Design a protein around this motif. Structure first.
Motif, short mmCIF file in Angstrom:
data_model
loop_
_atom_site.label_atom_id
_atom_site.label_comp_id
_atom_site.label_asym_id
_atom_site.label_seq_id
_atom_site.Cartn_x
_atom_site.Cartn_y
_atom_site.Cartn_z
N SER B 136 0.79 -1.33 0.13
CA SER B 136 -0.08 0.06 0.09
C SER B 136 0.80 1.13 -0.11
O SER B 136 1.73 1.46 0.77
N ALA B 171 -1.74 3.16 -9.57
CA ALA B 171 -2.80 2.24 -9.21
C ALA B 171 -3.10 1.41 -10.61
O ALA B 171 -3.24 0.14 -10.38
N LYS B 172 -3.03 1.87 -11.73
CA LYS B 172 -3.32 1.28 -12.88
C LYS B 172 -2.33 0.02 -13.37
O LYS B 172 -2.69 -0.92 -13.45
N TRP B 174 0.19 -1.16 -11.19
CA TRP B 174 0.85 -1.91 -10.20
C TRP B 174 -0.40 -2.73 -9.76
O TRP B 174 0.05 -3.72 -8.71
N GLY B 175 -1.58 -2.42 -9.82
CA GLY B 175 -2.87 -3.46 -9.56
C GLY B 175 -2.48 -4.71 -9.76
O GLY B 175 -2.76 -5.50 -9.12
N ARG B 176 -1.90 -5.23 -10.79
CA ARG B 176 -1.51 -6.56 -11.11
C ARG B 176 -0.65 -6.92 -10.24
O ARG B 176 -0.45 -8.34 -10.07
N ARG B 180 -1.46 -1.34 -4.13
CA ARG B 180 -2.56 -0.33 -3.84
C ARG B 180 -1.97 1.07 -3.91
O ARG B 180 -0.84 1.14 -3.03
N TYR B 236 -9.22 -3.68 -1.54
CA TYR B 236 -9.81 -3.51 -2.89
C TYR B 236 -9.94 -1.95 -3.28
O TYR B 236 -10.80 -1.58 -4.04
N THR B 238 -8.04 1.23 -4.30
CA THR B 238 -6.77 1.76 -5.14
C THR B 238 -7.42 2.99 -6.17
O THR B 238 -8.50 2.83 -6.56
#
Ligand SMILES: NC(=O)c1ccc[n+]([C@@H]2O[C@H](COP(=O)([O-])OP(=O)(O)OC[C@H]3O[C@@H](n4cnc5c(N)ncnc54)[C@H](OP(=O)(O)O)[C@@H]3O)[C@@H](O)[C@H]2O)c1
Ligand SMILES: NC(=O)c1ccc[n+]([C@@H]2O[C@H](COP(=O)([O-])OP(=O)(O)OC[C@H]3O[C@@H](n4cnc5c(N)ncnc54)[C@H](OP(=O)(O)O)[C@@H]3O)[C@@H](O)[C@H]2O)c1
Ligand SMILES: [Mg+2]
Lengths: 252, 251
Positions: B136, B171-172, B174-176, B180, B236, B238
């Motif tokens: 996070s 966020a876009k 590194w979400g994978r 977060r 959940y 992010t």
């Protein structure tokens, strides 16, 4: 009404793409146009096409907007040619694509130097002429990244554009007292030299189109109306706004 | 909302809002690395966390606008703890000038600290955050993400809107990896950074008019949201900009 005859506009990034489209819109409404980019022949070609098609006075000037001293000279050249400035369009921009964890640091700063610092420098140096205008209007060019980052590998660019949005708000706040309006046009997805690679991937383009309620990507002409509107006395109570011209992208 | 066994890096953790957040994390059981430009202040802040909350700490001098110093800061985290779960990017400056007169070096400097520095920390923290089962990153915004209530803060505003969009980009991407990335955007809190505003009764009166809860913020107001976002209970969440502003943005 929506008449810009006798007005003077400075369009950075006016030599091609979205900036050129906007320059045409302003020239069609009667605005004299100064085209600035890093290539003097290309700027001059664009300027000459504006005069030929629309009959307005134009000037071309070579300027890297990330270079403050060149911006200062750009604005001194406008003052010498025209003695006045009514409208600034900050369309000069670059992108560089890398995963954020591997983004070369010089490139990361460079994208912000052109997109954000350069946009500030132009606003800063245009101020003293804009204060002399009865209808002063600054139009910064955002992106969907002001609101949402729809592609990977564009961290620096996203940062720059979010910075432009907040900068735009600050300037609107400080300079409203001088009657200077400051707004952003945030385009959706438009096929240009900047976005060529994305558009060349049919999977990405099909995905993009699924998120566009109007069912197509943007063309430079789609920006002409909103630019003329914001420049005109018809938008005199509009400032500090981020206006998306994106076929409904942000609504869905 | 247990952070026991977790490690956090807090830039700007030596005082003000970053310190309040560091306390919140430490209280929930997190080990804390305090980073700032003043080693004495960082060291003293770190020791106060250990004394009050009984957690492991470390202080490390870093100017976040200096990339090599940030690289070294993250090496120091890895050496001390071998892991990192949470990053709080609270290091920040402001300089106040009319936009048309803003010195160009200071304009860049505010963005170098607030935006480039936030980026460098995120970038260098990546390799450890990837190894966490609960990663996070918490960036500190401002009201200027959304609206610029004061004059003379154009550079700062630009930096914080930059931070908001950067946050979304991370966020876009590194979400994978399950990382977060969120922003805490404080409203108005009396600190060293805002003292000059707070010292003008006219401005303070205006500020309080625009706060439904009828008071300005204190560092304790940011503890819960930092712990929440760092916790496994925010897995959940992010790409969000969360304002902790007593209702400022709602009115
Ligand atoms: N196409 C899209 O879907 C899209 C979407 C949202 C926002 N935008 C934004 O729209 C603006 C125009 O981009 P575009 O799509 O039209 O791409 P483009 O065709 O590549 O045009 C960019 C323009 O900026 C100039 N430029 C780049 N760096 C400059 C610098 N340092 N100083 C002066 N001029 C510079 C270019 O001229 P030189 O190379 O000769 O300098 C060119 O005139 C940018 O701000 C961009 O981020 C584009
Ligand atoms: N206070 C508010 O009302 C408010 C509102 C919105 C957002 N914020 C944000 O909250 C954050 C904390 O600020 P604050 O209000 O607590 O002000 P503050 O008391 O002045 O704290 C700033 C912190 O950042 C550190 N710092 C500044 N430049 C740094 C750099 N180059 N490298 C490393 N550390 C640096 C300071 O330590 P050193 O000086 O020792 O380096 C200190 O620990 C900032 O990001 C600020 O923009 C504050
Ligand atoms: Mg959306």
């Amino acid at each position: 009404v929506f008449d810009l005859r006798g007005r003077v506009a400075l369009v950075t990034g006016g030599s091609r793409g979205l900036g050129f489209g906007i320059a045409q819109g302003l020239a069609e409404a009667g605005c004299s146009v100064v085209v600035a980019s890093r290539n003097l022949e290309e700027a001059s070609e664009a300027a000459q096409k504006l005069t030929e098609k629309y009959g307005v006075e134009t000037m071309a000037f070579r300027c890297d907007v990330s270079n403050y001293e060149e911006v200062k000279k750009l604005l001194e050249a406008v003052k010498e040619k025209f003695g006045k400035l009514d409208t600034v369009v900050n369309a000069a921009g670059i992108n560089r694509r890398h995963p954020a964890e591997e983004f070369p640091l010089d490139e990361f700063r460079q994208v912000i130097e052109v997109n954000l610092f350069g946009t500030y420098y132009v606003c800063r140096e245009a101020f003293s002429l804009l204060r002399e205008s009865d209808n002063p209007s600054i139009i910064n060019i955002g992106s969907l990244t002001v609101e949402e980052v729809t592609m990977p590998n564009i961290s620096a660019y996203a940062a720059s554009k979010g910075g432009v949005a907040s900068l735009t708000k600050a300037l609107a706040k400080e300079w409203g007292r001088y009657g200077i309006r400051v707004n952003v046009i945030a385009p959706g997805w438009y096929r240009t030299k900047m976005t060529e690679a994305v558009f060349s991937d049919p999977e990405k383009l099909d995905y993009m189109l699924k998120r566009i309620p109007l069912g197509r990507t943007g063309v430079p002409e789609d920006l002409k109306g909103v630019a003329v509107f914001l420049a005109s006395e018809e938008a005199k109570y509009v400032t500090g706004q981020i206006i998306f011209v994106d076929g409904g992208w942000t609504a869905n």
